[PDB]
Enzyme design. Structure first.
Site, PDB file in Angstrom:
ATOM      1  N   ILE A   1      -3.173  -2.868  -3.656  1.00  0.00           N
ATOM      2  CA  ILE A   1      -3.644  -4.018  -4.424  1.00  0.00           C
ATOM      3  C   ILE A   1      -4.581  -4.788  -3.511  1.00  0.00           C
ATOM      4  CG2 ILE A   1      -3.020  -6.174  -5.620  1.00  0.00           C
ATOM      5  CD1 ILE A   1      -0.200  -4.749  -6.101  1.00  0.00           C
TER       6      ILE A   1
ATOM      7  N   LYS B   1      -1.441  -5.585   5.807  1.00  0.00           N
ATOM      8  CA  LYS B   1      -0.239  -5.875   5.020  1.00  0.00           C
ATOM      9  C   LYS B   1       1.029  -5.671   5.855  1.00  0.00           C
ATOM     10  CE  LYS B   1      -2.533  -6.876   1.308  1.00  0.00           C
ATOM     11  NZ  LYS B   1      -2.423  -8.154   0.553  1.00  0.00           N
TER      12      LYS B   1
ATOM     13  N   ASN C   1      -8.491   9.987  -1.727  1.00  0.00           N
ATOM     14  CA  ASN C   1      -8.871   9.161  -2.864  1.00  0.00           C
ATOM     15  C   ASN C   1      -8.320   7.755  -2.679  1.00  0.00           C
ATOM     16  OD1 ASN C   1     -10.331  11.115  -4.348  1.00  0.00           O
ATOM     17  ND2 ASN C   1      -8.428  11.959  -5.186  1.00  0.00           N
TER      18      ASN C   1
ATOM     19  N   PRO D   1       0.824  -1.202   0.000  1.00  0.00           N
ATOM     20  CA  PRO D   1       0.000   0.000   0.000  1.00  0.00           C
ATOM     21  C   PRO D   1       0.859   1.253   0.000  1.00  0.00           C
ATOM     22  CG  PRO D   1      -0.957  -1.607   1.456  1.00  0.00           C
ATOM     23  CD  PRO D   1       0.351  -2.185   0.990  1.00  0.00           C
TER      24      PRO D   1
END
Lengths: 114, 114, 114
Positions: free
Chosen positions: C64, C32, C97, C1
Site C-alpha cells: 500500500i 515499513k 511484478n 508489504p
C-alpha cells in the site's frame, strides 16, 4: 510476458515439452521475443472450480502491453486449446486473469523496463 | 470469483470439506452462483508474517465486480473467520489482496467474459 | 508489504535465515515496520524463462504505497542482488511484478486497511 498455470492435474500428466510449447506459442501470440517469455506450471493443486474437483486451472498472463479485449480473446482460445489438448482440462473449467503491466512496475536485471 | 489461500499450515490440518465451504460462503458473499466460484488452497508453504512463522496466510480474491470498500471489509471478516476457525490462523496474520477484474481481462472457455 | 518468490531453485539451496533476511531488507527498503512485512518463497518450481530452465525467479511485491518509478528501480537492484547472492539466480532471469495496492483492497484482521 509471464504465464502461470495452477492446476489439480497431477505432475505425471503434464507432457514432456509443455513449457517449451507454451513459450513458443506465447511468443507468437503476443509478438514478444521468446527470450522475454516466462512460463510456470504448478500441478497437483488442491483446487475446485464450481464446487467441483474435476480437472481445472487458474492462470494468469502478465504482459507490458499486448493486453486488450480482442487480444485476450485470442490468448484465451490459444491457452484453453493447449490446456485441453495437453492437460485434458475442459475450457469451461479454466480462468485466466490478464494483466497489462506498466513498464515502471516490472523489475528485471537490477532495474525496471521504464 | 476466484479465491486463493497460501499458507504454512500443513496439508493434514486442512479439514475435509474446506474447499466446498469456501465455495459456498464465497458464492453467498459475492452473490454469484457457486458454479462460477473457483477456490485454491496451497498448504505447507515456506512463509513468514511480521518476521515469524506461526500460522499465517497470503490470499487473493479476484472478481469481475463485487469489489469495493464495504464489500471488501465484509469479505475480510468472512474469510479471516473461516481461516481462524478451520485452519487456526490468527486474523492478524492474514493478508487478502482484492482485485476488481475487467470482464475483458478474464479468460474462460476459449474467450473472455466481455 | 508482501514479497513472493517463485523459483526452480531446489529447497535445499534456499539458505537458513533467507525469510528473515528478506523481511529485514524489505522493512529497510519500504520504510515499513517488519511487523507488516510478509514473505513467501516457493522453491522446486516447474518454470522457464526465455525457454530455458536454468535458475530463474518470478516474483511479486505488493504494498500500500511505496511503489513508483524510482522506488521500483531501487527494489529491483536490492531484490535481484539478494536472489543472485543467496539463490545464485542471474538478475536477467528474474521478473518482479510491483503492485501499488489501494488500502481498501487489502484485507487484514477481519477488515481492510482503509
Amino acid at each position: 510476458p509471464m504465464f502461470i498455470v495452477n492446476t489439480n492435474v497431477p505432475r505425471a500428466s503434464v507432457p514432456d515439452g509443455f513449457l517449451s510449447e507454451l513459450t513458443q506459442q506465447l511468443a507468437q501470440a503476443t509478438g514478444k521475443p521468446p527470450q522475454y517469455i516466462a512460463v510456470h506450471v504448478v500441478p497437483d493443486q488442491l483446487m475446485a472450480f464450481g464446487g467441483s474437483s474435476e480437472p481445472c486451472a487458474l492462470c494468469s498472463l502478465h504482459s507490458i502491453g499486448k493486453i486488450g479485449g480482442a487480444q485476450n480473446r485470442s490468448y484465451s482460445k490459444l491457452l484453453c486449446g493447449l490446456l485441453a489438448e495437453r492437460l485434458r482440462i475442459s475450457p469451461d473449467r479454466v480462468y485466466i486473469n490478464y494483466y497489462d503491466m506498466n513498464a515502471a512496475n516490472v523489475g528485471w536485471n537490477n532495474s525496471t523496463f521504464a
